[PDB]
Amino acid sequence: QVQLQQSGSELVRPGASVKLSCKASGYTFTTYWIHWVKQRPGQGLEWIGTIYPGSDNTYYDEKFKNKATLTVDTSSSTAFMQLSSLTSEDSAVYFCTRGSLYYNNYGWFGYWGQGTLVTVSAAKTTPPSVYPLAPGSSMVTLGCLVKGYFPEPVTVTWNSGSLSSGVHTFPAVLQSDLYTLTSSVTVPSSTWPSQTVTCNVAHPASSTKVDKKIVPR
Amino acid sequence: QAVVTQESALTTSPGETVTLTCRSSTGAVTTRNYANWVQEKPDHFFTGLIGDTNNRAPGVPARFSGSLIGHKAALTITGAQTEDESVYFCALWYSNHWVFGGGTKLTVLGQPKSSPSVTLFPPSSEELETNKATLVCTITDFYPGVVTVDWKVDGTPVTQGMETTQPSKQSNNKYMASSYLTLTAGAWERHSSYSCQVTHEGHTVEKSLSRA
């Protein structure tokens, strides 16, 4: 019923701007404060500002005094945030969230939009480079490094899905406008290298596939 | 310019009572701060537990009680449940603005504690052929889901070219994470021993490799 609809994600260019949107439903948009909050990877929430859509009274954090502009269109029940002159610093998830009927008193941040992963990057669709990770030496943990691709995501499997348990695939990291992740798999010592183990990486966005057999260093 | 700080991370068994605190660096926290507590859960799911200092939002279990203890705001869980594992964020209001604490990570012990499996891979000669050297440190199967990663080279510590993904939940309810050390190939061949150390529950796991 009460619902906050933000677009899933947005790719922005280092220098450009973006108008994030947050669409209210289930109650009267003009009667509750919207707040905008920034969150990064494993970091705190950072409160940007708030807007009363019934009044247009808006308060901003000093930090974001010249970064964000809050706006509303009451006829489409949408609060907007405008972010200006973007840098990687601004790459984050941004949430709109619903406050109280009142300034601070009788309410909660009781409802939140899904968030919008804003990604600042100058990259074009770039396929991945995949590197085998063998150990330097019970059981043995191989892996492969998927480096320098864009955009998210990739799909890694091992022996075309044949090895399933013992597979860990970690979150991407954004370094120099490009994504990196890694996958590992643990297999019995003797099995490998006698039997082959191969990561099959694939990038949907570039329609590229790279298989990579792991061999002892 | 007011900094709100919470306890970094706290641990507790099911049934226990625990208190998260929320400190203001402006001074004492009063009701005039309308301390709100909000909870974050995997897949960025937020729930507003307490507003107006001690006002529970409807439906929220009794378990949770907002309170002022001394000079600090406080959230208390009385009969902590396993589903309470979460980041908890307090927020305080100040002359028109809100500020969020950095958040406490709460672990309600669902299973015995578990030390990470660390694995340190060296760079592949393929990456090396592109004049790059990435060391990858994989950390899995830890509980509580709270670690800090450090890297050392030939003894001395690193603060350049390090990245660690935030610990994410494995399907057995333990956690995993990865940490990277990106350097030049030049630099990699200039040093001998490389080390990856995860601290966890007041002790340290360390994998390292010497250069061949």
Side-chain angles (χ1 to χ4, degrees):
Chain A
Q1 300 313 328
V2 166
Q3 217 143 39
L4 297 173
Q5 277 181 126
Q6 306 174 273
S7 33
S9 57
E10 220 138 312
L11 192 167
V12 82
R13 293 324 190 180
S17 291
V18 63
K19 201 192 193 163
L20 300 199
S21 72
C22 168
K23 157 116 196 190
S25 22
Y27 67 101
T28 304
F29 183 49
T30 77
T31 75
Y32 286 81
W33 291 83
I34 296 300
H35 309 250
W36 291 86
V37 186
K38 185 170 160 201
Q39 174 165 65
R40 315 280 257 88
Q43 285 195 338
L45 298 164
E46 224 172 348
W47 184 80
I48 292 162
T50 200
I51 192 160
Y52 192 74
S55 185
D56 293 333
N57 200 353
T58 79
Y59 303 99
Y60 295 91
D61 180 21
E62 182 83 334
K63 260 84 181 144
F64 297 92
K65 192 193 183 180
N66 298 304
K67 208 90 203 199
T69 323
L70 302 191
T71 44
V72 295
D73 178 16
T74 55
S75 86
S76 77
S77 296
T78 306
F80 296 98
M81 189 176 214
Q82 177 105 39
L83 293 176
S84 53
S85 289
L86 293 162
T87 52
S88 29
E89 276 269 285
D90 312 303
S91 263
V93 182
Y94 296 79
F95 307 95
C96 64
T97 173
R98 209 193 58 176
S100 179
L101 290 158
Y102 307 118
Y103 275 55
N104 46 78
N105 317 270
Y106 269 71
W108 299 274
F109 302 104
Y111 290 97
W112 297 62
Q114 88 175 298
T116 293
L117 178 43
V118 158
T119 294
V120 183
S121 171
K124 288 177 177 206
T125 298
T126 306
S129 297
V130 183
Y131 301 114
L133 314 181
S137 308
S138 198
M139 221 152 306
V140 157
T141 304
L142 313 176
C144 78
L145 175 38
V146 185
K147 194 172 165 220
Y149 62 93
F150 189 92
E152 281 275 62
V154 290
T155 77
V156 183
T157 76
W158 288 89
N159 290 0
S160 305
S162 196
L163 306 170
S164 21
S165 36
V167 175
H168 293 106
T169 280
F170 305 86
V173 166
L174 192 52
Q175 323 201 121
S176 310
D177 281 29
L178 298 168
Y179 284 115
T180 298
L181 68 79
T182 61
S183 186
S184 76
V185 45
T186 313
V187 304
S189 316
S190 102
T191 66
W192 183 84
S194 333
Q195 286 179 36
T196 90
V197 165
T198 297
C199 59
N200 342 88
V201 165
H203 198 229
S206 54
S207 312
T208 49
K209 258 169 289 206
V210 160
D211 288 352
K212 215 91 208 191
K213 201 171 137 192
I214 317 298
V215 293
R217 301 183 43 85
Chain B
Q1 53 142 314
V3 165
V4 164
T5 50
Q6 313 181 231
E7 293 105 338
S8 200
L10 283 167
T11 302
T12 190
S13 283
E16 301 199 341
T17 313
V18 170
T19 318
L20 285 66
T21 63
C22 172
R23 187 186 93 73
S24 167
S25 79
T26 307
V29 175
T30 58
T31 58
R32 290 181 183 175
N33 296 95
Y34 308 91
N36 274 242
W37 293 86
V38 169
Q39 186 200 53
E40 172 155 30
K41 286 250 201 148
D43 299 319
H44 307 314
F45 186 73
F46 293 95
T47 306
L49 305 152
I50 271 134
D52 214 342
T53 311
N54 64 7
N55 197 15
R56 230 187 329 265
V60 169
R63 246 195 280 160
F64 305 90
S65 23
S67 178
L68 268 158
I69 300 155
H71 54 316
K72 296 201 282 287
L75 174 50
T76 316
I77 297 164
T78 310
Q81 235 122 45
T82 75
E83 294 88 11
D84 297 340
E85 191 153 300
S86 278
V87 198
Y88 291 79
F89 288 106
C90 74
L92 301 173
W93 180 86
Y94 286 130
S95 199
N96 283 324
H97 307 75
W98 294 92
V99 178
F100 283 100
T104 293
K105 286 183 282 195
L106 189 68
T107 301
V108 176
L109 281 170
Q111 57 183 289
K113 282 156 106 190
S114 183
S115 287
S117 275
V118 182
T119 308
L120 178 58
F121 299 101
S124 52
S125 55
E126 279 126 294
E127 186 178 28
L128 275 192
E129 268 172 73
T130 69
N131 199 48
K132 297 290 175 176
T134 289
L135 297 82
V136 183
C137 200
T138 55
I139 317 168
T140 56
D141 299 287
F142 53 97
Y143 194 61
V146 172
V147 286
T148 68
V149 194
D150 286 325
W151 292 80
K152 313 216 153 173
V153 168
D154 297 341
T156 65
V158 185
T159 55
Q160 289 180 350
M162 264 137 133
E163 278 262 4
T164 317
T165 66
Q166 293 314 287
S168 56
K169 225 176 177 173
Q170 288 170 190
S171 91
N172 63 340
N173 272 31
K174 300 208 213 200
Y175 291 84
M176 74 188 199
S178 66
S179 200
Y180 298 94
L181 183 42
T182 291
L183 24 61
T184 80
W188 153 258
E189 277 185 67
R190 279 186 78 106
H191 307 84
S192 163
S193 92
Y194 297 84
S195 200
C196 183
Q197 43 164 291
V198 187
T199 284
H200 187 254
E201 301 302 282
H203 69 256
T204 259
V205 192
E206 182 171 351
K207 299 303 184 103
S208 62
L209 50 91
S210 272
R211 218 210 346 111

